[PDB]
């Protein structure tokens, strides 16, 4: 019937918006990802600089000697 079909087109509308979800959300997932991978490269930097402070300290002490 007619009113049934009107609001059934409404349900079709809700289906198409969820199709929009299906098209958008995972792209959001793998755009969050690489930000984090760069942050892991940043972990690598942090480890490097851990190594670096001690070197600086021993260098300055031997400079004093």
């Amino acid at each position, epitope marked *: 019937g007619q009113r049934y079909e009107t609001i059934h087109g409404g349900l079709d509308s809700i289906g198409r918006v969820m199709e929009h979800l299906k098209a958008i959300e995972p792209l959001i997932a793998e755009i969050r990802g690489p930000v984090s*991978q760069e942050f*892991e*490269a940043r972990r*690598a*930097e942090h*480890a*490097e600089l851990i190594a670096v402070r001690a070197n600086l300290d021993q260098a300055q002490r031997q400079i004093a000697l």
Partner: nanobody
């Protein structure tokens, strides 16, 4: 049928580096390996197929496509490892046939 990358600095002061293949709709995959030694190996799929070579001078590494069957069609990205870190570039793609 021949592809390369350049590092920021310190080629051969850069230890192990390798290349990776990204077939579409699939996840990451290693391709071939050069070392600081020039010691080299490939993955079984591309064994015999691809050839890799290092130029010590101009801060670079080389991959040359060979006798390719379209199945290898993918987007490739060249990788390197430095004092325990990842190093990834932007990569580039290869096509059918």
């Amino acid at each position: 049928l021949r592809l390369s990358c350049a590092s920021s600095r310190s080629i051969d002061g850069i230890n192990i580096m390798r290349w990776y293949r990204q077939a579409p709709g699939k996840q990451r995959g290693m391709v071939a390996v050069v070392t600081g030694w020039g010691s080299t190996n490939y993955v079984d799929s591309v064994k015999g197929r691809f050839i890799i070579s290092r130029d010590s001078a101009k801060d670079t590494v080389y991959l040359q496509m060979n006798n390719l069957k379209p199945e290898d069609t993918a987007v490739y990205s060249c990788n390197a490892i430095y004092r325990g870190s990842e190093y990834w570039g932007q990569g580039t793609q290869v096509t059918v046939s």
